[PDB]
Design a protein around this nucleic acid. Structure first.
Ligand SMILES: [Zn+2]
Ligand SMILES: [Zn+2]
Ligand SMILES: [Zn+2]
Lengths: 41, 221, 95, 79, 144, 101, 100, 103, 881, 122
RNA sequence: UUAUGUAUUUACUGACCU
């Protein structure tokens, strides 16, 4: 089974994963972890 | 050795037609024994005599000569004894002699008679009846022996003979431990036994078909 | 509460008690039945009856007010007749 | 009179008619009194625990059975 | 009505078990008596959590399974991996062709080696006593 | 002939909002005598009506030959209402013999 | 059974009448509901064996063929020493399928 | 029925990314409900990356309201002319704008 | 006829009273109004737009919105249940049961009840609606108190309904309504439906009282029956109450017995009443009670025999018929003197009433003859002189074969007359009518003969009569129209009774069958093949194997059929021949019989599959030397597609054939097949190859399957891992006490399975722990189980129902293995825990321990010290010698 | 009970037409040799002539027999009819069974013996 | 970032089922 690893979310099949690329934007809430990565832009 | 399922107390009809196996609480069973044409023993389905919240101290076969079989048992109902925190409600909760009559015509067990007791009896003794004797149940108890039989017999009390001045009693009662009925083809007697070993010869001497008075004597030790 | 001082129907008559109860239930629900008057009969057949079960099964037909006042009427008549060796309550001893 | 204590039984989910089982809201006193009653019927049930208890006093076996039997009504004390 | 962990911890002969919820019981003294009775095992750690006992095992990837050694010394792992790897190359053409014309004797290992591995070479595993209940980490705390 | 068809009633659905009072009297006294009508108040029920007659055959005339009849420009559908309920069981009526018959 | 969780057992006192299973359910255990190791006959109560209901299947209520049994795993758990295992109600299966 | 939920839309996007344009049986071979006709129908009707599936302009609306008067039906002839081109996005525009020109 | 007061009492609120020519149309004002509502939901039929009318408009939930749309979101739910796809059905149905306490009984029942009270329902819609009602009766306990009567006036005609399952639905929900509404609500509710004028509601209220009497016991309402039956203002009340007594007797059969006496003393206040209806139903109630008692309570009926005797002497009409049913049911309960006396002076009335025209009295005397000749009294020559000749004169007609309750009663009485008189006396009176031209009448005569000759035997039939019945059953077998088996089973039972005396009829029969097996292909070829399967038994025990070898080879090539139901009976016949001959001595030998059966095995019809693998199973264990041993391999790829077969007898026979194929060719080729089968996505196809893995395990011992089955837990797929755990479940369940050797090999597997995140892993490993726990009991393996208990025990809090019942079965299976002491040690310090969520689960684990072993816990309880008022120390255990 | 016999004699013909029983053995071959039929449940307003008018549709009834009571009554409720031909009785028991005249539903069956003055089912 | 309520697929369970 398939897992969004930053998301920590499980997925039964393939189209359950690659339709989880749009909701719950931790995908851009890694801007906080990028601000911890670098204190500027 | 559970509390609810039967097996502790076992009574049988003296003619040999039923048998009751009973627990110390809540549930009793009656099998109906017969014989079929190979002279072979057969057993019916177990009849039920369930009665909730009920202790049973002893059970015994009441002799009734080719009548509906009856079983006598010393019961005690304790639900008001455990509902009342005052403590005195469980102090005045005397036993009941109860008679279960098996309607062979209707194939079930009914509580026929239920009479309280002014002391706590511990075990019962069958009296032979039908044609042989005054059909009933003796009731042994602390410092007493009592013939009770339902319907018309007044309750006959006989206080148990203590010894002369035996030095074991500050305050202690005296019970029986054995029954040992005997049927000598003229009369019938009972070799009862107190807890020290003092066998008594209890004889029922009845002027009517009703009992009149009971009497006993120090047989041996 | 007051319905728990026990009764023994061997101590009481019943054929003198029925017309009062018929008259009361004709007062209570207005008209006449039989099956509730025969409820009174058949519930009071048993020698040591129960008053709480009586009150439930009359609360069903009647209001739950009228069952309450009916038990508070009917149970002291049973006690006032079972005290007496005659078996008759005070409303029918005096009248 | 009475009020609103109409609770005759309900959905027969498991029928725990085995007395002594107990449920979630079972107090200390209730399961200890079931524990004492099961202990007493197992004492007089087995012959040999009744032997062991009769040796400790000098009381005979019917004395011990009558004592154990009359204690099964209220063994722990009043509620 | 609910006397707190101070007094309840003062009363009990073993105060080392009374917790922050035992005050909120419906009978505290027997609860911390049975909590301090001798050989009991406690309630699992996840009765109060929010995570349904193992839904915290999300993103960690773990090895498949270590076979015990007496099974691995039969060669069944190597034969089985070999024919799985050979079967991963087959198309449906040959998977349906060798369904009706089957080559057999693919494994045919022996019966005496397997009998010896379960009967001569049986290994007692590493068990545990009855107290050692399982919680969620429990094998990543191998630091003891 | 026809018992199992409930009559003296006629459910009317998809009826215009411009019905002031008169047009239901028109269409439903056109076929025979009327008992009355029911006009809704909820904007659901506004636009959906009942009509009750004193005659069975007039309700048959209505429902046999007004099905999908187009009117002021929304065609209505007719059915037979189902009487199933009440709200108050009427009581203490006398309705004595009184020597009328 | 264990599969249909809404089926209720009779659970009254087991008489002398030996239980029977239909032809569709021969070999099934009654409680654990499996096929292997039958060890103990089924005794059913007299109300669930009366008149029209004699020799009828314990589970299906179809016409019985062979005798019914408990597993060894029901026996040694003493799941045979409770009431009679005659499944009473027919609920939510083989009813809607009849309506389908 | 042709319901076309998301877990087949995204697999169709992956399949058209892999296989191609005039090759539809080979990508209906992995969808368990759909035929190749329905795959063509969706990937040109909804999933085509040229479809500007939002952003109603003002030039195209004044275009279509006297383009759907030239040829009054026929929203597959005037769909490539408008270029909104989903041929029902045009019908959405035309019925929405004749609701808003009525109200 | 109406007035305006009844009129606005009738209608709901939200309402107020108050040639030709051509031109054109124009573009409209968009006459496109909604007729079906706003969603996907279902389609609405034109009759459902009163009940679901409020859904065609959108609420937009505000400004028309109290909580009431929440209590008419149930309108959407009833529409989704009544007319929807089954996912929508179970979705809406689970939703309405989970919120049934939230919606309340008011809105929910006053929408459900007028929907059922529509004249345009359907049996499946009635089924789904009564499903909705009984599913909301578990949740609305003690809340249907106003709504009992409004449920009953809908539900009650389910009791008198035609189809049986609708009657069972009626009885079950009135029993649930009885246990939910208590008792006083019932007596309050259904009393005014006694005196009511309509006999439909009066009969149906009587049956409703009977079913609530069964659900709540007789003596709760026995004063009510005693009340309503002695009421004397209108006879309809007495008729109704005695009808109640009748249906209580016919509902709960022998559980009326301990209340019988106090129940029969009601009924004898009837039988003397002035209405013939009341006396008639009092006799019918006595007949139901006497049917129900059987054979008990005869001295409880002794107050009834004198009015029954006076009634049968003085009356004539239907009161005589009810009295006659009553005495016919009584006299088997009676001792032999009084029974023989009442028999010998009721036979005169029965001979007087064989002339009777009415059909119900024909049914009643046809029942009375069954019981009044079974006892001891009526001797044989009396019966065969004048009981049976007018019997066969007046009852063996054609119309009594048509009516099914007159069909089966007549044949079941004719069998009893054959029990008393003899075999050939009845048979020789009806054997000539196996040659009749009514199919139902030949069916009746054949069922009569098969029951007689199965009960008694065939020794009484001479050689002047067995040819009569042989030609009778041959003519009857040749000319049947229907697909019934009754004449097939009749043929089989007859020839099994004749035994070896059928020897000069086997040429006639086998000639008739072999010619009979061509016949236009007109489906009387499964009659010929079924007849071969039925008479295959009698030819071995009659020293005939030449003609067995003759029709074995004929059935070898009638198996190339295109009709499936022909070929299924062919395979059934060939199966019966393979049994009745040896396998290794049969004329189409198994070397070239099984290869004909391997392409038959790819035929997806259920009958052909079923018979084919029964035959392949017998060949695969008893004849495995007739192959290539390549051939068994290329059919054990056929037995995987021979799963997924919707009959469960196929699926449990094919796993046996895997076991036998394995014992032939070894468990390393069949098992790689069954392990490639474990990745399919389909149950019915993975659980039944898991079972086959356990079969190939236990036949050819594990250590032949268990290394590879232990290996394939390492394959990273969900299905194969749950498959090897489920196969360990079935394996330990099958092998039992051989689990003493393999428990250390699978404990490191089950610790990983119970340690795993997914809960299906944990439920399957818990089932394995259970079966292993019961298989190693008493062998000293209580250390491994106490290890695995530490991993089972945290699964206690799971609320998925399958995994909670799997772990709770595992705990009550570990009770006996490691002890009640160890399980009681784990139950303690959590029975009293503050959360109820943990407390109730540990109390039901403790209840399973307590009822599982109550006495063994006595040593194992903790010590609990004394508080202020109570003594909690069991002192008797504590003191010493 | 008084008119479930209507349902039973109707279920006879419905089960024959269901099973397809030929007319040689279609139950009327037992009530051969009898042109008599028992009526049942007539209204008491029915004279002899009105019964002849309704049941003469399949042939003029030769011998009618109402059960007029002895002195105090006028009609009890039966009638027996004897037609010309027995097939008229077949037609009448098929066609006139379960029709209803002025309220009450009537029934027809064969007789096969004689004019029995009172035995049959009131 | 644990989490809800729901619209809602997809997977999975019970040797479920003619
Ligand atoms: Zn089992
Ligand atoms: Zn039962
Ligand atoms: Zn079955």
């Amino acid at each position: 089974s398939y897992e969004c690893k930053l998301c920590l979310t499980l997925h039964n099949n393939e189209g359950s994963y690659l339709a989880h690329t749009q909701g719950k934007k931790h995908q851009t809430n890694l801007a906080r972890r990028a601000a911890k990565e670098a204190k500027e832009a | 050795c559970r509390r609810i399922v039967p097996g502790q107390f076992l009574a049988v009809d003296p003619k040999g037609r039923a048998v009751m196996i009973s627990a110390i609480e809540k549930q009793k069973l009656v099998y109906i024994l017969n014989r079929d044409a190979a002279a072979r023993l057969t057993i019916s389905s177990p009849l039920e005599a369930h009665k909730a919240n009920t202790l049973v101290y002893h059970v015994v076969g009441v002799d009734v000569g080719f009548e509906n079989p009856m079983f006598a048992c010393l019961e005690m109902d304790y639900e008001e004894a455990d509902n009342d925190p005052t403590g005195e409600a469980a102090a005045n909760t005397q036993q009941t002699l109860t008679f279960y009559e098996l309607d062979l015509g209707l194939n079930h067990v009914v509580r026929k008679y239920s009479e309280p007791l002014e002391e706590h009896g511990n075990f019962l003794i069958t009296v032979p009846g039908g044609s042989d004797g005054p059909s009933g149940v003796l009731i042994c108890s602390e410092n007493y022996i009592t013939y009770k039989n339902f319907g018309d017999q007044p309750d006959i009390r006989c206080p148990i003979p203590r010894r002369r001045n035996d030095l074991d009693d500050p305050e202690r009662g005296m019970i029986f431990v054995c029954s040992a009925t005997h049927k000598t083809k003229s009369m019938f007697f009972f070799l009862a036994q107190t807890e020290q070993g003092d066998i008594f010869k209890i004889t029922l001497e009845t002027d009517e078909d009703m009992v009149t008075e009971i009497r006993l004597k120090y047989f041996d030790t | 509460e007051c319905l728990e001082k026990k009764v023994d129907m061997s101590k009481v008559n019943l054929e003198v008690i029925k017309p009062w109860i018929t008259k009361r239930v004709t007062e209570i629900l207005g008209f006449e039945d039989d099956v509730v008057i025969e409820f009174i009969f058949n519930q009071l057949e048993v020698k040591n009856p129960d008053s709480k079960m009586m009150q439930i099964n009359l609360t069903g037909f009647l209001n739950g007010k009228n069952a309450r006042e009916f038990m508070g009427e009917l149970w002291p008549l049973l006690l006032s007749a079972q005290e007496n060796i005659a078996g008759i309550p005070s409303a029918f001893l005096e009248l | 009179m009475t009020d609103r204590y109409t609770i005759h039984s309900q959905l027969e989910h498991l029928q725990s008619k085995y007395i002594g089982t107990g449920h979630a809201d079972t107090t200390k006193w209730e399961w200890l009194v079931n524990q004492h009653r099961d202990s007493y019927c197992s004492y007089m049930g087995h012959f040999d625990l009744l032997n062991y208890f009769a040796i400790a006093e000098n009381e005979s076996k019917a004395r011990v059975r009558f004592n154990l039997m009359e204690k099964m009504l209220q063994p722990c004390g009043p509620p | 009505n609910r006397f707190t962990v101070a007094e309840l911890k003062q009363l009990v002969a073993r105060p080392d078990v009374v917790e922050m919820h035992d005050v909120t019981a419906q009978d505290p003294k027997l609860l911390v008596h049975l909590k301090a009775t001798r050989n009991s095992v406690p309630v699992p750690r996840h009765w109060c959590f929010k995570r349904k006992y193992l839904q915290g095992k999300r993103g960690i990837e773990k090895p498949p399974f270590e076979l015990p050694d007496f099974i691995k010394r039969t060669g069944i792992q190597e034969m089985r991996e070999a024919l799985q790897e050979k079967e991963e190359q087959k198309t449906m053409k040959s998977k349906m062709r060798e369904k009706v014309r089957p080559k057999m004797g693919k494994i045919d290992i022996d019966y005496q080696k397997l009998h010896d591995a379960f009967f001569k070479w049986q290994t007692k595993p590493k068990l545990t006593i009855h107290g050692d209940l399982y919680y969620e980490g429990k094998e990543f705390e191998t630091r003891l | 002939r026809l018992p199992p068809e409930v009559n003296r009633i006629l459910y009317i659905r998809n009826l215009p909002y411009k019905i002031t009072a008169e047009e239901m009297y028109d269409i439903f006294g056109k076929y025979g005598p009327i008992r009355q009508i029911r006009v809704g108040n909820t904007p659901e029920t506004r636009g959906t009506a009942y009509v009750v007659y004193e005659d069975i055959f007039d309700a048959k005339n209505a429902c046999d030959h007004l099905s999908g009849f187009n009117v002021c420009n929304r065609y209505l559908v007719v059915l037979y209402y189902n009487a199933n309920r009440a709200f108050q069981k009427m009581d203490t009526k006398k309705k004595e013999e009184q020597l009328k018959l | 059974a264990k599969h249909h969780p809404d089926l209720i057992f009779c659970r009254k006192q087991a008489g002398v009448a030996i239980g029977r299973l239909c032809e569709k359910c021969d070999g099934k255990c009654v409680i654990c509901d499996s096929y292997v190791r039958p060890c103990t006959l089924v005794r059913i109560c007299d109300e669930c064996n009366y008149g029209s209901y004699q020799g009828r299947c314990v589970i299906c209520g179809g016409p019985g063929v062979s005798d019914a049994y408990y597993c060894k795993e029901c026996t040694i758990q003493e799941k045979d020493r409770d009431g009679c295992p005659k499944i009473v109600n027919l609920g939510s299966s083989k009813t809607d399928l009849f309506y389908e | 029925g042709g319901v076309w939920r998301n877990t087949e839309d995204e697999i169709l996007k992956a399949a058209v990314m892999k296989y191609g344009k005039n090759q539809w049986s080979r990508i209906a071979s992995l969808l368990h409900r759909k035929s190749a006709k329905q795959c063509k129908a969706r990937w040109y009707e909804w999933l085509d990356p040229s479809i500007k599936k939002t952003e109603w302009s003002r030039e195209e609306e004044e275009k279509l309201l006297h383009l759907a008067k030239l040829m009054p039906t026929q929203w597959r002839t005037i769909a490539p002319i408008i270029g909104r081109t989903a041929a029902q996005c045009l019908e959405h525009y035309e019925f929405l704008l004749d609701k808003a020109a009525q109200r | 006829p109406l007035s305006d007061e009844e009129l606005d009492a009738m209608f709901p609120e939200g309402y107020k009273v108050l040639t030709g020519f051509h031109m054109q149309t124009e573009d409209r004002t968009m006459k496109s109004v909604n007729d079906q509502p706003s969603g996907n939901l279902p389609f609405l039929k034109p009759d459902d737009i009163q009940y679901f009318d409020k859904l065609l408009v959108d609420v937009d939930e505000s400004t028309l919105s109290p909580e009431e749309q929440k209590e008419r979101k149930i309108m959407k739910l009833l529409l989704k249940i009544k007319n929807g796809t089954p996912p929508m059905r179970k979705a809406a149905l689970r939703q309405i049961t989970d919120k049934a306490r939230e919606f309340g009984a008011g809105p929910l029942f006053n929408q459900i009840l007028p929907l059922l009270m529509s004249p345009t329902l359907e049996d499946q819609e009635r089924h789904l609606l009564v499903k909705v009602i009984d599913r909301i009766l578990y949740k609305l306990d003690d809340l249907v108190r106003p709504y009992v009567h409004k449920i009953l006036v809908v539900i009650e005609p389910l009791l008198i309904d035609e189809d049986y399952y609708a009657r069972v639905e009626g009885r079950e929900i009135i029993s649930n309504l009885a246990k939910a509404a208590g008792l006083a609500t019932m007596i309050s509710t259904m009393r005014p439906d006694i005196d009511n004028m309509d006999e439909y509601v009066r009969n149906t209220t009587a049956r409703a009282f009977a079913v609530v009497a069964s659900a709540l016991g007789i003596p709760s309402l026995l004063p009510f029956l005693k009340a309503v039956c002695k009421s004397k203002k209108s006879w309809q009340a007495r008729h109704t109450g005695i009808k109640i007594v009748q249906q209580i007797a016919i509902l709960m059969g022998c559980a009326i017995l301990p209340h019988l006496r106090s129940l029969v003393e009601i009924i004898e206040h009837g039988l003397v009443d002035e209405q013939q209806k009341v006396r008639t139903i009092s006799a019918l109630a006595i007949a139901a009670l006497a049917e129900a008692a059987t054979p008990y309570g005869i001295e409880s009926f002794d107050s009834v025999l004198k009015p029954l005797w006076k009634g049968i002497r003085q009356h004539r009409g239907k009161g005589l018929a009810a009295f006659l049913k009553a005495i016919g049911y009584l006299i088997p309960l009676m001792d032999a003197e009084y029974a023989n006396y009442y028999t010998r002076e009721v036979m005169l009335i029965l001979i007087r009433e064989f002339q009777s025209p009415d059909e119900e009295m024909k049914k009643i005397v046809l029942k009375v003859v069954k019981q009044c000749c079974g006892t001891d009294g009526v001797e044989a020559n009396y019966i065969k002189t004048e009981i049976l000749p007018p019997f066969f004169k007046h009852f063996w007609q054609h119309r009594m074969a048509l009516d099914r309750r007159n069909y089966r009663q007549l044949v079941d009485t004719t069998v009893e007359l054959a029990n008393k008189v003899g075999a050939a006396e009845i048979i020789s009176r009806i054997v000539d009518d196996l040659k009749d031209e009514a199919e139902q009448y030949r069916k009746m005569v054949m069922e009569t003969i098969e029951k007689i000759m199965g009960n008694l035997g065939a020794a009484d039939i001479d050689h002047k009569l067995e040819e009569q019945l042989i030609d009778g059953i041959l003519y009857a077998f040749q000319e049947q129209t229907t697909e019934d088996s009754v004449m097939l089973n009749g043929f089989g039972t007859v020839v099994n009774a004749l035994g070896k005396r059928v020897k000069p009829y086997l040429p006639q029969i086998c000639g008739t069958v072999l010619w009979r097996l061509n016949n236009k292909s007109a489906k009387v070829r499964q009659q010929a093949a079924d007849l071969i399967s039925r008479t295959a038994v009698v030819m071995k025990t009659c020293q005939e194997e030449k003609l067995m070898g003759h029709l074995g080879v004929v059935l070898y090539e009638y198996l190339g059929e295109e009709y499936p139901e022909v070929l299924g009976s062919i395979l059934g016949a060939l199966k019966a021949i393979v049994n009745v001959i040896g396998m290794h001595k049969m004329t189409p030998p198994i070397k070239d019989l099984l290869p004909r059966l391997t392409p038959i095995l790819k035929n997806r019809h259920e009958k052909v599959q079923e018979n084919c693998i029964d035959l392949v199973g017998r060949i695969a264990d008893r004849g495995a030397e007739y192959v290539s041993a390549r051939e068994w391999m290329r059919i054990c790829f056929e037995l995987l597609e021979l799963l997924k077969a919707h009959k469960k007898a196929i699926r449990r026979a094919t796993v046996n054939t895997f076991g036998y194929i394995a014992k032939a060719i070894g468990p390393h080729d069949v098992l790689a097949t069954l392990l490639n089968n474990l990745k399919v996505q389909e149950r019915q196809n993975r659980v039944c190859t898991t079972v086959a893995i356990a079969i190939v395990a236990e036949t050819c011992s594990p250590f032949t399957v268990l290394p590879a089955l232990m290996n394939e837990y390492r394959v990273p797929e969900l299905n194969v891992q749950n498959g090897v755990l489920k196969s360990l479940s079935f394996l330990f369940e099958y092998i039992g006490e051989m689990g003493k050797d393999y428990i250390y090999a699978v404990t490191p597997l089950l610790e990983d399975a119970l340690m795993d995140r997914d809960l299906v892993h944990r439920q399957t490993a818990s089932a394995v722990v259970q079966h292993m726990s019961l298989g190693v009991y008493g062998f000293g393996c209580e250390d491994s189980l106490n290890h695995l208990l530490n991993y089972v025990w945290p699964n206690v809090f799971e609320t998925s129902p399958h995994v909670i019942q799997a772990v709770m079965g595992a705990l009550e299976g570990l009770r006996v293995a490691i002890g009640p002491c160890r399980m009681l040690q784990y139950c303690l310090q959590g029975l009293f825990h503050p959360a109820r969520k943990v407390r109730d689960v540990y109390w039901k684990i403790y209840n399973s321990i307590y009822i599982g072993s109550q006495d063994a816990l006595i040593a194992h309880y903790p010590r609990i010290y004394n508080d202020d008022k109570n003594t909690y120390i069991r002192y008797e255990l504590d003191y010493i010698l | 009970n008084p008119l479930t016999k209507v349902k039973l004699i109707n279920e006879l013909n419905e089960r024959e037409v269901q099973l397809g029983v030929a007319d040689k053995v279609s139950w009327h071959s037992e009530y051969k040799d009898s042109a008599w039929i028992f009526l049942g449940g007539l209204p008491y307003e029915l004279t002899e002539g009105d019964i002849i008018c309704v049941f003469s549709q399949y042939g003029e009834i030769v011998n009618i027999n109402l059960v007029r009571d002895k002195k105090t009554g006028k009609s009890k409720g039966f009638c027996f009819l004897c037609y010309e031909d027995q097939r008229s009785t077949i037609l009448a028991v098929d066609n006139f069974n379960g029709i209803k005249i002025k309220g009450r539903t009537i029934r027809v069956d064969h007789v096969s013996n004689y004019r029995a003055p009172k035995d049959s089912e009131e």
